[PDB]
Design a protein around this ligand. Sequence first.
Ligand code: HEC
Ligand code: HEC
Lengths: 127, 127
Amino acid sequence: QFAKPEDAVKYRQSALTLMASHFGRMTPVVKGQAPYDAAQIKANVEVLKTLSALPWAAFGPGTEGGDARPEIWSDAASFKQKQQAFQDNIVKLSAAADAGDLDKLRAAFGDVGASCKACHDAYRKKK
Amino acid sequence: QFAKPEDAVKYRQSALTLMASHFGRMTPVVKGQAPYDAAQIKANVEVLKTLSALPWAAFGPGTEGGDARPEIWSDAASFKQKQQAFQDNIVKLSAAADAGDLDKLRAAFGDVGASCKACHDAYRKKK
Ligand code: HEC
Ligand code: HEC
């Protein structure tokens, strides 16, 4: 869906920015600094589920650019494993949110965040 | 969910960029220049449905910035009507996509695009 590589870059950056807002806005809830409304979090995690599937199709071959390491492209199976571990962690977060369980939510949230960081450290250029 | 107004601006710009990609990527299909796969379009419109609900909460009071006209804020009921007409046009597009009907899809797509343009012309600063 991208006319030029720059368009894929802009899409994935926007997707990741959203995904990041929908993940990070739950930090006060997971920490107890904001109240836990199970329905609110269920709905937000559904949004996050949708968003978390979107970035990956915008790293199609030859779309080097942005802060993406070339290592994404030449190690496709392995990048795919990082992506797929992250979404299976998102599945677990959805299960916790759907269950309405703050303890399970906190644990699952931590696992997701670790998976964000794992891909970051391997595949996101240093600033 | 935004620490500063700039964060709301960046969120809504990213949301709108996505929404725009998920809408615009269907143009070749609606024009017949690309094949029509009813399941593909159903799935894409579902993504668009999710995305099309997201920008509006990131124009919360005092979040003037970006290309948003101040007119969004002082005319809240009316901006809300433009937003709500646009999503009711998205509901119609979902119905067309779920029906698997290229004629209904084309008509509904045109209506959505008109609603994008209506809000654009009223509420998006001139470049
Ligand atoms: C888990 C919920 C997260 C969160 C919070 C973020 N990511 Fe990543 N990310 C990855 C790569 C390769 C990039 C660079 C993309 C490019 O510039 O071409 C990024 C970038 C980001 C950003 C910045 C986006 C921007 O506006 O420029 C942010 C805020 C971000 N990420 C947050 C790679 C991955 C992954 C590889 C499989 C995974 C998993 C994640 N990111 C997960 C997350
Ligand atoms: C219907 C599917 C669309 C499409 C394709 C786009 N919009 Fe809009 N839009 C609105 C406002 C106020 C802005 C400015 C936001 C800001 O800068 O603070 C925008 C911006 C955009 C963009 C640019 C985003 C960016 O990356 O900077 C794009 C690509 C875009 N729009 C496409 C306002 C509205 C509406 C008011 C109710 C509606 C409806 C739409 N936009 C619909 C669409």
